[PDB]
Every structure is written in structure tokens, then in C-alpha cells.
Short mmCIF file of C-alpha atoms and ligand atoms in Angstrom, two decimals:
data_model
loop_
_atom_site.label_atom_id
_atom_site.label_comp_id
_atom_site.label_asym_id
_atom_site.label_seq_id
_atom_site.Cartn_x
_atom_site.Cartn_y
_atom_site.Cartn_z
CA UNK A 1 125.39 260.95 153.66
CA UNK A 2 127.61 258.33 155.15
CA UNK A 3 128.92 259.11 158.68
CA UNK A 4 132.64 259.62 159.38
CA UNK A 5 134.32 256.81 161.20
CA UNK A 6 136.15 257.55 164.46
CA UNK A 7 139.77 257.06 163.47
CA UNK A 8 142.03 258.72 166.07
CA UNK A 9 145.50 260.00 165.42
CA UNK A 10 147.93 258.37 167.86
CA UNK A 11 151.44 259.72 168.34
CA UNK A 12 153.40 256.50 168.29
CA UNK A 13 156.83 258.01 168.88
CA UNK A 14 157.07 256.77 172.47
CA UNK A 15 157.06 253.22 171.16
CA UNK A 16 160.52 253.78 169.72
CA UNK A 17 161.98 254.87 173.12
CA UNK A 18 162.53 253.81 176.68
CA UNK A 19 159.80 255.73 178.62
CA UNK A 20 157.59 252.88 179.80
CA UNK A 21 154.70 254.93 181.22
CA UNK A 22 154.53 256.92 178.01
CA UNK A 23 154.37 253.63 176.06
CA UNK A 24 151.46 252.50 178.26
CA UNK A 25 149.57 255.65 177.47
CA UNK A 26 150.07 254.94 173.76
CA UNK A 27 148.95 251.32 174.35
CA UNK A 28 145.73 252.52 175.93
CA UNK A 29 144.98 254.56 172.83
CA UNK A 30 145.62 251.51 170.66
CA UNK A 31 143.35 249.44 172.90
CA UNK A 32 140.58 252.01 172.64
CA UNK A 33 140.81 252.28 168.83
CA UNK A 34 140.98 248.47 168.47
CA UNK A 35 137.83 248.05 170.58
CA UNK A 36 135.97 250.81 168.66
CA UNK A 37 136.16 251.00 164.85
CA UNK A 38 139.36 249.04 164.60
CA UNK A 39 141.36 251.75 162.84
CA UNK A 40 143.75 254.48 163.88
CA UNK A 41 146.32 256.71 162.21
CA UNK A 42 149.85 256.39 163.47
CA UNK A 43 151.48 259.79 163.45
CA UNK A 44 155.03 260.87 164.37
CA UNK A 45 156.16 257.59 162.82
CA UNK A 46 159.42 258.87 161.41
CA UNK A 47 159.01 257.57 157.85
CA UNK A 48 159.44 259.87 154.83
CA UNK A 49 156.15 259.10 153.16
CA UNK A 50 156.36 261.89 150.65
CA UNK A 51 159.53 260.35 149.24
CA UNK A 52 157.85 256.89 149.31
CA UNK A 53 155.01 258.32 147.25
CA UNK A 54 157.39 260.05 144.81
CA UNK A 55 159.54 257.02 144.20
CA UNK A 56 156.48 254.81 143.80
CA UNK A 57 154.90 257.22 141.30
CA UNK A 58 158.14 257.27 139.29
CA UNK A 59 158.01 253.47 139.11
CA UNK A 60 154.30 253.15 138.30
CA UNK A 61 154.42 255.81 135.61
CA UNK A 62 157.52 254.52 133.86
CA UNK A 63 157.10 250.82 133.83
CA UNK A 64 156.18 249.57 130.34
CA UNK A 65 153.91 246.76 129.17
CA UNK A 66 156.92 244.68 128.24
CA UNK A 67 158.35 244.95 131.77
CA UNK A 68 154.97 244.10 133.30
CA UNK A 69 154.83 240.75 131.47
CA UNK A 70 158.41 240.07 132.42
CA UNK A 71 157.66 240.66 136.13
CA UNK A 72 154.17 239.15 136.16
CA UNK A 73 152.84 236.74 138.77
CA UNK A 74 151.69 233.31 137.58
CA UNK A 75 148.05 234.36 137.38
CA UNK A 76 149.05 236.51 134.41
CA UNK A 77 152.09 234.66 133.04
CA UNK A 78 152.13 230.86 133.03
CA UNK A 79 155.91 230.87 132.56
CA UNK A 80 156.35 232.21 136.10
CA UNK A 81 155.18 229.28 138.19
CA UNK A 82 157.28 230.30 141.24
CA UNK A 83 155.63 233.74 141.41
CA UNK A 84 152.49 233.29 143.45
CA UNK A 85 152.85 236.41 145.68
CA UNK A 86 155.79 238.50 144.42
CA UNK A 87 155.77 240.46 141.14
CA UNK A 88 153.49 242.44 138.93
CA UNK A 89 149.71 242.25 138.96
CA UNK A 90 148.52 243.61 135.63
CA UNK A 91 145.51 245.69 134.87
CA UNK A 92 143.22 244.59 132.10
CA UNK A 93 142.14 247.72 130.20
CA UNK A 94 138.38 247.81 129.82
CA UNK A 95 137.95 245.29 132.69
CA UNK A 96 140.28 245.63 135.69
CA UNK A 97 141.66 249.06 136.50
CA UNK A 98 143.99 248.41 139.41
CA UNK A 99 147.54 247.22 138.99
CA UNK A 100 150.22 246.53 141.53
CA UNK A 101 153.69 245.32 142.41
CA UNK A 102 154.27 243.05 145.44
CA UNK A 103 157.54 242.26 147.08
CA UNK A 104 158.52 240.19 150.12
CA UNK A 105 161.38 240.05 152.61
CA UNK A 106 164.61 241.01 150.84
CA UNK A 107 166.36 238.33 152.90
CA UNK A 108 164.50 235.65 150.89
CA UNK A 109 167.47 235.03 148.66
CA UNK A 110 168.18 231.87 146.63
CA UNK A 111 170.28 230.53 149.49
CA UNK A 112 167.68 231.14 152.25
CA UNK A 113 166.71 227.84 153.89
CA UNK A 114 162.99 228.31 153.25
CA UNK A 115 163.64 229.13 149.57
CA UNK A 116 165.86 226.08 149.27
CA UNK A 117 163.10 223.99 150.86
CA UNK A 118 160.44 225.52 148.55
CA UNK A 119 158.25 226.25 151.56
CA UNK A 120 154.90 227.75 150.55
CA UNK A 121 154.52 231.56 150.80
CA UNK A 122 158.28 232.19 150.48
CA UNK A 123 159.61 233.55 147.18
CA UNK A 124 162.62 235.46 145.88
CA UNK A 125 161.62 238.94 144.80
CA UNK A 126 161.65 239.98 141.16
CA UNK A 127 162.81 243.46 140.13
CA UNK A 128 162.79 245.54 136.97
CA UNK A 129 166.04 246.32 135.14
CA UNK A 130 168.24 248.70 137.17
CA UNK A 131 169.08 250.81 134.10
CA UNK A 132 165.37 251.40 133.39
CA UNK A 133 164.48 252.06 137.06
CA UNK A 134 167.59 253.47 138.64
CA UNK A 135 167.57 253.28 142.42
CA UNK A 136 164.15 251.63 142.63
CA UNK A 137 165.16 248.25 144.04
CA UNK A 138 167.43 249.85 146.62
CA UNK A 139 164.75 252.31 147.63
CA UNK A 140 162.11 249.62 147.90
CA UNK A 141 164.25 247.30 149.97
CA UNK A 142 165.16 250.14 152.32
CA UNK A 143 161.44 251.00 152.59
CA UNK A 144 160.75 247.43 153.64
CA UNK A 145 163.11 247.85 156.53
CA UNK A 146 161.78 251.32 157.45
CA UNK A 147 158.19 250.02 157.63
CA UNK A 148 159.38 246.89 159.39
CA UNK A 149 160.82 249.13 162.09
CA UNK A 150 157.60 251.08 162.46
CA UNK A 151 155.63 247.81 162.54
CA UNK A 152 157.83 246.40 165.26
CA UNK A 153 157.17 249.47 167.37
CA UNK A 154 153.45 249.17 166.73
CA UNK A 155 153.53 245.53 167.77
CA UNK A 156 155.05 246.56 171.07
CA UNK A 157 152.09 248.87 171.56
CA UNK A 158 149.59 246.13 170.73
CA UNK A 159 151.29 243.74 173.15
CA UNK A 160 151.15 246.27 175.96
CA UNK A 161 147.55 247.07 175.09
CA UNK A 162 146.60 243.39 175.58
CA UNK A 163 148.31 243.11 178.97
CA UNK A 164 151.41 241.33 177.62
CA UNK A 165 155.15 242.12 177.71
CA UNK A 166 156.18 244.40 174.86
CA UNK A 167 157.97 241.63 172.88
CA UNK A 168 154.94 239.32 172.83
CA UNK A 169 154.33 239.72 169.09
CA UNK A 170 157.63 241.34 168.09
CA UNK A 171 159.67 238.35 169.12
CA UNK A 172 157.99 236.47 166.22
CA UNK A 173 158.56 239.35 163.73
CA UNK A 174 162.13 238.95 162.66
CA UNK A 175 164.16 240.17 159.67
CA UNK A 176 165.47 236.73 158.76
CA UNK A 177 162.06 235.12 158.39
CA UNK A 178 159.08 237.50 158.27
CA UNK A 179 156.43 236.74 155.68
CA UNK A 180 155.45 240.43 155.56
CA UNK A 181 154.70 241.96 152.17
CA UNK A 182 154.71 245.39 150.58
CA UNK A 183 152.21 246.06 147.80
CA UNK A 184 152.55 249.14 145.63
CA UNK A 185 149.02 249.58 144.26
CA UNK A 186 148.18 252.01 141.48
CA UNK A 187 144.52 253.10 141.17
CA UNK A 188 144.26 254.99 137.89
CA UNK A 189 142.28 257.90 136.63
CA UNK A 190 140.41 256.64 133.51
CA UNK A 191 138.16 258.53 131.10
CA UNK A 192 135.92 256.67 130.42
CA UNK A 193 136.14 254.41 133.46
CA UNK A 194 134.96 250.96 132.50
CA UNK A 195 131.88 249.74 134.36
CA UNK A 196 133.25 246.24 134.38
CA UNK A 197 135.98 247.49 136.71
CA UNK A 198 133.43 248.94 139.16
CA UNK A 199 131.71 246.65 141.63
CA UNK A 200 128.42 247.50 143.33
CA UNK A 201 127.73 246.84 147.03
CA UNK A 202 124.38 245.61 148.28
CA UNK A 203 123.78 249.20 149.52
CA UNK A 204 124.45 250.66 146.07
CA UNK A 205 127.93 251.99 146.81
CA UNK A 206 130.31 251.77 143.88
CA UNK A 207 133.44 249.88 144.88
CA UNK A 208 136.88 249.06 143.64
CA UNK A 209 137.34 246.24 146.22
CA UNK A 210 134.62 244.46 148.15
CA UNK A 211 134.29 243.88 151.88
CA UNK A 212 136.93 241.87 153.57
CA UNK A 213 139.07 241.32 156.63
CA UNK A 214 142.81 241.59 156.07
CA UNK A 215 145.05 238.54 155.99
CA UNK A 216 147.65 239.84 158.43
CA UNK A 217 148.49 240.31 162.08
CA UNK A 218 148.20 244.08 161.51
CA UNK A 219 148.19 246.17 158.33
CA UNK A 220 150.31 249.35 158.08
CA UNK A 221 148.97 251.43 155.19
CA UNK A 222 150.05 254.58 153.41
CA UNK A 223 147.52 256.09 150.92
CA UNK A 224 147.22 259.22 148.92
CA UNK A 225 145.04 262.01 150.11
CA UNK A 226 141.86 260.79 148.31
CA UNK A 227 139.12 259.46 150.54
CA UNK A 228 138.12 255.86 149.68
CA UNK A 229 138.01 253.44 152.59
CA UNK A 230 134.92 252.48 154.54
CA UNK A 231 134.63 250.43 157.71
CA UNK A 232 131.56 248.43 158.82
CA UNK A 233 130.51 249.40 162.34
CA UNK A 234 127.31 248.76 164.32
CA UNK A 235 126.05 252.02 162.81
CA UNK A 236 126.71 250.75 159.27
CA UNK A 237 129.53 251.53 156.84
CA UNK A 238 131.38 254.70 157.77
CA UNK A 239 133.95 256.70 155.80
CA UNK A 240 137.59 256.63 156.90
CA UNK A 241 139.16 260.06 156.35
CA UNK A 242 142.32 260.14 154.27
CA UNK A 243 145.57 261.40 155.87
CA UNK A 244 148.61 261.19 153.58
CA UNK A 245 150.93 262.14 156.45
CA UNK A 246 150.04 259.17 158.68
CA UNK A 247 149.85 255.46 158.43
CA UNK A 248 146.43 253.84 158.73
CA UNK A 249 146.64 250.86 161.09
CA UNK A 250 144.18 247.96 161.56
CA UNK A 251 144.18 244.40 162.80
CA UNK A 252 143.94 241.42 160.52
CA UNK A 253 142.25 238.14 161.15
CA UNK A 254 145.29 236.56 162.86
CA UNK A 255 144.97 239.16 165.62
CA UNK A 256 141.27 238.41 165.90
CA UNK A 257 142.07 234.73 166.27
CA UNK A 258 144.76 235.23 168.91
CA UNK A 259 142.59 237.58 170.98
CA UNK A 260 139.28 235.63 170.57
CA UNK A 261 137.86 238.55 168.64
CA UNK A 262 138.58 241.06 171.45
CA UNK A 263 140.49 242.98 168.80
CA UNK A 264 138.32 242.25 165.81
CA UNK A 265 139.66 242.36 162.27
CA UNK A 266 137.45 245.13 161.01
CA UNK A 267 135.43 244.55 157.84
CA UNK A 268 136.23 247.21 155.31
CA UNK A 269 135.96 248.00 151.64
CA UNK A 270 137.37 250.36 149.03
CA UNK A 271 135.05 252.86 147.28
CA UNK A 272 135.39 253.49 143.59
CA UNK A 273 136.90 256.91 143.01
CA UNK A 274 138.03 258.05 139.53
CA UNK A 275 141.33 259.48 140.67
CA UNK A 276 145.00 258.66 140.12
CA UNK A 277 146.09 257.49 143.54
CA UNK A 278 148.26 255.10 145.54
CA UNK A 279 147.53 252.46 148.13
CA UNK A 280 150.79 251.12 149.72
CA UNK A 281 150.05 248.48 152.34
CA UNK A 282 152.54 246.60 154.46
CA UNK A 283 150.97 243.40 155.69
CA UNK A 284 152.62 242.48 158.98
CA UNK A 285 153.02 238.68 158.86
CA UNK A 286 155.02 236.59 161.27
CA UNK A 287 157.30 233.67 160.41
CA UNK A 288 156.09 230.45 158.84
CA UNK A 289 156.34 228.43 162.01
CA UNK A 290 155.36 231.19 164.42
CA UNK A 291 152.55 230.10 166.74
CA UNK A 292 151.08 232.22 169.48
CA UNK A 293 148.72 230.50 171.87
CA UNK A 294 145.32 232.11 171.66
CA UNK A 295 143.99 233.95 174.69
CA UNK A 296 141.01 236.08 175.75
CA UNK A 297 141.62 239.41 177.66
CA UNK A 298 137.98 239.50 178.67
CA UNK A 299 138.19 236.29 180.68
CA UNK A 300 139.66 236.23 184.19
CA UNK A 301 141.92 233.23 183.43
CA UNK A 302 142.77 234.48 179.92
CA UNK A 303 141.73 231.14 178.39
CA UNK A 304 140.26 230.80 174.94
CA UNK A 305 138.47 227.86 173.26
CA UNK A 306 140.41 228.50 170.01
CA UNK A 307 143.20 226.19 168.86
CA UNK A 308 146.72 227.32 168.05
CA UNK A 309 147.30 228.06 164.40
CA UNK A 310 150.76 228.49 162.90
CA UNK A 311 151.19 231.65 160.89
CA UNK A 312 152.22 229.80 157.78
CA UNK A 313 149.04 227.73 157.85
CA UNK A 314 147.00 230.86 158.40
CA UNK A 315 148.66 232.79 155.61
CA UNK A 316 148.62 230.16 152.87
CA UNK A 317 144.89 229.50 153.51
CA UNK A 318 143.95 233.16 153.86
CA UNK A 319 145.53 234.49 150.68
CA UNK A 320 143.79 231.80 148.62
CA UNK A 321 140.46 232.46 150.33
CA UNK A 322 140.62 236.23 149.70
CA UNK A 323 141.34 235.63 146.00
CA UNK A 324 138.38 233.28 145.78
CA UNK A 325 136.09 235.71 147.63
CA UNK A 326 137.08 239.06 146.08
CA UNK A 327 138.89 238.16 142.87
CA UNK A 328 142.43 238.02 141.57
CA UNK A 329 143.97 241.48 142.03
C1 LIG B 1 144.89 248.20 151.32
C2 LIG B 1 143.82 247.32 150.65
C3 LIG B 1 142.42 247.77 151.13
S1 LIG B 1 143.89 245.60 151.23
C4 LIG B 1 142.96 244.98 149.79
C5 LIG B 1 143.19 245.97 148.68
C6 LIG B 1 144.01 244.82 148.21
O1 LIG B 1 144.68 244.76 147.17
C7 LIG B 1 143.76 243.78 149.27
N1 LIG B 1 144.60 242.75 149.85
C8 LIG B 1 145.06 241.71 149.16
O2 LIG B 1 144.68 241.60 147.99
C9 LIG B 1 146.10 240.83 149.77
C10 LIG B 1 147.47 241.08 149.15
C11 LIG B 1 148.49 240.08 149.72
C12 LIG B 1 149.85 240.15 149.03
N2 LIG B 1 149.72 239.95 147.58
C13 LIG B 1 150.72 239.12 149.74
O3 LIG B 1 151.11 238.11 149.14
O4 LIG B 1 150.98 239.31 150.93
C14 LIG B 1 143.92 247.24 149.13
C15 LIG B 1 143.40 248.39 148.32
O5 LIG B 1 142.66 248.04 147.35
O6 LIG B 1 143.66 249.59 148.60
FE1 LIG B 2 142.08 245.65 153.56
#
């Protein structure tokens, strides 16, 4: 058997309020989880995740092949050269089981200065026809802002955890410019499940997605109640329990850089499970020009021998590297 990873449930509700001692006690729990396996469940988060899952299922199950081509990223549709990040990521029956829909900041409109400038990593979202998917765009955009709010509260907890003022990260996480993304991932049930869509780890574990660190500051993840994630610890890969009431939280490699690996970006992977399920990450990205000076909370003077890295530089390089390492999703 594989051991169960220690993934505590942390009541994050004080991070939305004004009780500073209570927020420090949440911050300590974040610190402890970040120094241990690197994962925790945020509970009492205030988001209606059941309705998220229902609306997402309605979308995934009703979108047609025609609509998928019409929304497709450039990796699948050469006509869509502006769609690097945002749009549909098709499955390939017999070969690639997963499919997904990514969207970015709804404030990236045609008139946004970074869209006008054609700055890398910024794109205008694409949406299916309203008549075919009534209410979907509005729901999805509202979800962006709901998860943005949760993420901002979480970032206040991380800041406090690291000995900083509570706006240390949040001041760089702003509605007008955040590079954060939502991905609505569908993992299908298939009978037969094609072997070509199943990867095998060096330890023999069947996988849907190989080991990686996230490209993010933090990742704020809702999943169905089907166990699938594993985290590498000193004791080997351990199973992360599912909890479809909570959000699973981890640090990405930008946090590891800024903290000199004090809060590591945990290495994790996705087991192959032949089940119809959802994986709905929010990748908490800062603005393109956001730079936080790296530090080290283990050193008396806080100094680090890492160089400052703007978030835009980080993100553009990281997304490419993850595609090269683990394949086009
Ligand atoms: C939550 C994950 C483990 S993370 C891992 C995999 C994924 O699809 C993985 N992550 C990525 O591919 C990066 C998506 C970035 C997004 N298009 C953007 O432009 O910002 C997920 C899963 O398979 O459940
Ligand atoms: Fe991941």
C-alpha cells in the first residue's frame, strides 16, 4: 500500500475578517503544512463548490465537437494563433483522454493595455455560444472572482506565515492585471480505456499526469471526490485524500523561489483512475511586472542568494517548460 499524506484541514474563515490573532493562528497552520507535505485543504472557504461542479458538468457534457474546434487553442487549431493559454484543449480518442477549457482574467478585454500591447501570457477569453450554453460565461466569470477572493485571503495567510505584513503577496494580486487562470478539466470514464492515454511511473504506478511542480504562486484546486493525487515526500509518494467540500492548496515554484525553498513547491502527480471526474484548478499568478525580492525566513538577516524574477518572465518560461516536460494537455 501507499501511505496517506498528511494534508490538514484548515478553517480559513478568519482570513476574511478583522481578528488579527485568529489570523495568526491560521497562518501558523499554513506554515506547518507548507513545511511538511506542502498541501492542505482550505475549509470554511465560503464558495459554493457543488454549484461549481454542476455548472461545469453541464458545460463538459453538452459541448459538441464542432464547438471544441471553434474554441480550440493553437496547439489544436492553427487558425487560432492568439490562443496560447485560453480556450479548449481537445482529447484525442484512443490517445489522450483528458480535455479541458482554460480561461483568464475577464478584465483582459480588447481594450486592456496589455492586450493592446500584445504582451505575452495575456489573451482575451473565448466563450461558447450563449444560446447553446446559457448562463455559462456569466457563471464562469463570477467563479473567477469568487476564487480570486478566496485566493486573496489565502495569500494574506501565507504572508503572515512567512513573517510579513498581510498584504505582502496580495498587493501584487489585483483584478485589473492578474495572470491567474481557471482550468476546467474533464477526466473521462472510458471503456476500454486506451493504454496510450495511461503513463507509467518508474515505480509502476499508472498515471494520467506525470510528476511536476506547479507553475504558480499557489494553486487553489477543487476536485471531485475520487482519490487521484500523490505527493512526493521523504517517505516516498503518498496519497492525498480527496475532499470535494474543500479546496486543496499548495505552493508553486514562484513561492519556492521567493522563499529560497523554505516553502517548497511540492512534487506531485496524478494517478490514472477510470472514473468520470473533474479537476478545477485556479493558478494564482501575479501581474506581468510584479517582482518580489527573494528572501529566506531561515536566515537571521532574511537574505537570499537568489535574484529577483518578474512574474511575467517566470510564467512565460514555466508554462513552456511544463509542456515540454509533461506533454501538451
Ligand atoms: C491540477 C493539476 C494536477 S495541475 C496539472 C494537471 C494539469 O493539467 C497541470 N497544469 C498545467 O498543465 C498548467 C496549466 C496552465 C494553464 N493552461 C494556464 O495557462 O495558466 C492537473 C490535473 O491533471 O488534475
Ligand atoms: Fe499540479
